[PDB]
Amino acid sequence: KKVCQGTSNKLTQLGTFEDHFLSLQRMFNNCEVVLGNLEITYVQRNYDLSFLKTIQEVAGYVLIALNTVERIPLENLQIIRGNMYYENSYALAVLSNYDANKTGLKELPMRNLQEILHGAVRFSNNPALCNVESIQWRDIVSSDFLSNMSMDFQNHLGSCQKCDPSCPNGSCWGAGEENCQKLTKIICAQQCSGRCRGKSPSDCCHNQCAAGCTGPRESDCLVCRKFRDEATCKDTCPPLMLYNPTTYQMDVNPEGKYSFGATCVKKCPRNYVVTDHGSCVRACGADSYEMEEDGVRKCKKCEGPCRKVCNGIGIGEFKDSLSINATNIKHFKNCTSISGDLHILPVAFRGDSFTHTPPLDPQELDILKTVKEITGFLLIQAWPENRTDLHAFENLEIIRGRTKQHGQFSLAVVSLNITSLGLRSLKEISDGDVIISGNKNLCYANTINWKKLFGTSGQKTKIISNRGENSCKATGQVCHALCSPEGCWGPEPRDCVSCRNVSRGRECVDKCKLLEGEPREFVENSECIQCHPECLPQAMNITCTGRGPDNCIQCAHYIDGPHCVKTCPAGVMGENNTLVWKYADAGHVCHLCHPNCTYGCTGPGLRGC
Amino acid sequence: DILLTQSPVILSVSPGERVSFSCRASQSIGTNIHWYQQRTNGSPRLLIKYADESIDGIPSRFSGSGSGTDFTLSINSVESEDIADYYCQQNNNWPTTFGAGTKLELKRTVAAPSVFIFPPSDEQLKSGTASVVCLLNNFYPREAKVQWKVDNALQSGNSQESVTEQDSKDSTYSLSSTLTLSKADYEKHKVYACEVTHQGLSSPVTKSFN
Amino acid sequence: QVQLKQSGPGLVQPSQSLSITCTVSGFDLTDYGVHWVRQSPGKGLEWLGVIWSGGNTDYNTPFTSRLSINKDNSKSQVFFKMNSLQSNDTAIYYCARALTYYDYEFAYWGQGTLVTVSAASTKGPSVFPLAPSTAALGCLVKDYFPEPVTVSWNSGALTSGVHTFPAVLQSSGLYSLSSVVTVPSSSLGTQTYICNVNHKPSNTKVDKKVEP
């Protein structure tokens, strides 16, 4: 069905009467299911509300207030789920539909509203309203809310059409036999759990039904009390993961369904992203990025900071600005990619009268630590003298040099007090030349093989007038013994280009915690990967043979099939929509509980229950 | 170079009074002197030409006299509209030159300022700077003292003030003082106070917020 | 009726030139000289020069080497140009005509041209509310350059109790000005108050509602 969000403006007016109307129409035209709230306010006399005929569900609340329109044709609204209230505990609230002009809302023909899952109903000050007072809300509303109800009726603007003789107890929503109240709760047999399509015992609805039914199956409900999966009404969308007794791990349920409103879809509707818990949402959170898996778009929490690209210096907000300076630096917060160039000039640190920009507090440069990519060039003419390396760009992975300074340099580092370039993440310089001049204390630039970094031919390096390669060697400012001959960005073992031995995270080390360290590790392609926490460390032998709890030599706590687990599976969903319960034996091996062990079993059989 | 020296710098008089402006030339120049009125934000307006000749369109209450070195502009019964700068100009020696002007102030009874303090707007605080404003409205005479106090600590060097011209209707002044602090500094203290000293106040008046 | 109307810049960069056009009406340029005289706060009025009826010019001694005055009788225009400007050429510039032929009693003046000499950049103001707790309220017009800023209240409908203060120069090199108005405290709930700020040099127009 066709869905729409609805609104939550409560009694707020949006512009003039016409503008407000236009936005209401724009919102609900062709809507069948309102996932949020249906709010109808300030609709003046003679305005056409006929599109409302399409609505059949309001997941949230229905508020009908301050209207002058004579008729509000919510003829096909079957249910208001009341997942949200308006004031107090009202799911439906129809208030003050009149004006100075003594003309108000006359007809509210909700002849199909048979169910209000949650909440009460409020009716106040509707001098023109007709017929609704006949309605037996006991059939509509859940007994739990009958107490919080607020129904006040008083006709004083006009005479009302009478109900059809065919209506039960003379209860109707308006004129005609079609507007008679259909009763599906109060008239049911005592045997009936909920709704019914007649007084007889045969004519009885499946418990999962709301409003009514055509037959006695869970597929014949008019509306589903909880969820609708294709044609059947279910308690909850079939879970995406199920416990597979064969593999002992959680597998993707082939019959898996996402939740969308009160529906169970096999694939989210267009422009909807699946969350980390199976629900369909218009857009991913702050801590997450969007991706595509098996054709269905999904939200995945961002590994580091979420990719945020911003304009470079001279572009966007920074247009006509000469450098990263005290004013603009604020805008670089959380930036991961810089679309264009970065200029860091002396004018930043001196402050600039002409542009009325104050001196930059060097600490602010930490804002740039999130930058991993610069499409244009990186130009550094000034740096805090007490900082020995270019720390702010320590996470900078790539400079593309799509645009270059003087159409020539993609990396320019000139006359700074720095001792090392500390560009530990710089893995690639796609285009442009690299010039390093005038840094009296700069010591490692040379050791680097810049041809590795370069992506194009013609790129040259110009490293001149820095600290003496001889004086560098002489004062021990050289590459760490853990570095590969490929050079380094500074003295630290993390500044190496590549390791002589192995690496743990970003750091080069001489050995992995293969046999002795506390977080035991294995080696893969010269990388130290920690062992699964459930693997028990092995004295004088390797602890694990790979990533995962199956590649363990020995388990630390319990074993489920081939896996090592901190605890046995308990209360996890499985096929046949049954809960899975296991117990641990003397050898700490997990085994299924007796099917009768509803809350679990400490041991085998009925005994351990 | 021939100097024209005007006195007083400020001439304070009461309405209806006879008022005279003095303009003295370093050299004798006969009657080659002209007088101008300049109201605030206006162009100079020629009042008198050649020491004593009336100018068409100029109120009769304006007249001039003098010959030699000492010249005088007189308003025989001063009116509120006469508040202005008044300048002399010499006509006699190349290049023509102007005096530094006399500003006319009108006396009235002492009037105490009505004082208001305004905290920085939340909007401004977003920019990282807080301007706090103290207003002294409709007082007389112009001499007034604004002192800013922060948690009983008196501020210096971090305030600016300005004063309106004399009002055309009631002859009072108003003064605006702005204390400007960084947001962090703003948030570091508690008591923000403006203390006013003026002839019309029996004791200094302090307005404040936290 | 004799009138002189000036046109010309506001901000001139140092060492660059300043040009003002004085368009006259109500007389003939072939019959009268047009003088240019300026006014600096700390210089009072200073005569700069004159282009006479016959097309000849005279320039005051300090400006003889950097001043140019030309004219077009047919177009009733006088062109003032001054070269090599410095900070202490900041002033209001007037053209003027005398009452009688050949003389120096300036009976007629242009409306003046405010010339700022500064190498800085133009910046539009930010505007913040000053709200009440008879009550006073206002607008803070902060950090703009150069002068002037014009302010009205409720589009000019409220000119009673309004005081717009002289701008002050902030060390940032930017001006700041406040404008306030006093009204009965009983009006704070019922009447809406909007300050209209216009900074013409930057084409910045702002309307700000001020309320508790």
Ligand SMILES: *[C@@H]1O[C@H](CO)[C@@H](O[C@@H]2O[C@H](CO)[C@@H](O[C@@H]3O[C@H](CO[C@H]4O[C@H](CO[C@H]5O[C@H](CO)[C@@H](O)[C@H](O)[C@@H]5O)[C@@H](O)[C@H](O[C@H]5O[C@H](CO)[C@@H](O)[C@H](O)[C@@H]5O)[C@@H]4O)[C@@H](O)[C@H](O[C@H]4O[C@H](CO)[C@@H](O)[C@H](O[C@H]5O[C@H](CO)[C@@H](O)[C@H](O)[C@@H]5O)[C@@H]4O)[C@@H]3O)[C@H](O)[C@H]2NC(C)=O)[C@H](O)[C@H]1NC(C)=O
């Ligand atoms: C530090 O970091 C900060 C933050 O990143 C940087 O801040 C930025 O600085 C920029 C550069 O200073 C600045 O942009 C300048 O804006 C000023 C003023 O702009 C406003 O006024 C102009 C002029 O209006 C009048 O003139 C034009 C034509 O002359 C008429 O059309 C108009 O009707 C007026 O009569 C407006 O045009 C302008 O509007 C524009 O911007 C707004 C939004 O801001 C838009 O809505 C609008 O549609 C327009 O796009 C503003 O209202 C400008 O003066 C300046 O422009 C200069 O650039 C041209 C070409 O590049 C240049 O030739 C001119 O230079 C003249 O002036 C020089 C001195 O300034 C002088 O030396 C020359 O001889 C020459 O005469 C021209 O002035 C800039 O565009 C940014 O707005 C500002 N950003 C922020 C957020 O504050 C800062 O620069 C950094 N500094 C350092 C050192 O690192």
Ligand SMILES: *[C@@H]1O[C@H](CO)[C@@H](O[C@@H]2O[C@H](CO)[C@@H](O)[C@H](O)[C@H]2NC(C)=O)[C@H](O)[C@H]1NC(C)=O
């Ligand atoms: C420029 O860098 C040099 C070295 O990186 C700094 O000089 C050293 O400062 C440390 C303390 O921070 C001392 O222990 C060393 O002995 C110094 N080395 C010398 C003097 O050769 C120098 O301070 C930096 N300059 C500035 C302005 O910070």
Ligand SMILES: *[C@@H]1O[C@H](CO)[C@@H](O)[C@H](O)[C@H]1NC(C)=O
């Ligand atoms: C940066 O990201 C953090 C994430 O926790 C967020 O709290 C902060 O508001 C963000 N700031 C900006 C300017 O994006």
Ligand SMILES: *[C@@H]1O[C@H](CO)[C@@H](O)[C@H](O)[C@H]1NC(C)=O
């Ligand atoms: C560098 O200098 C600043 C300012 O003098 C100082 O605050 C800071 O502690 C110094 N050391 C650093 C940033 O490691």
Ligand SMILES: *[C@@H]1O[C@H](CO)[C@@H](O)[C@H](O)[C@H]1NC(C)=O
């Ligand atoms: C104005 O400044 C210039 C220097 O740029 C100087 O020649 C001139 O005498 C100054 N005039 C003053 C200070 O009145």
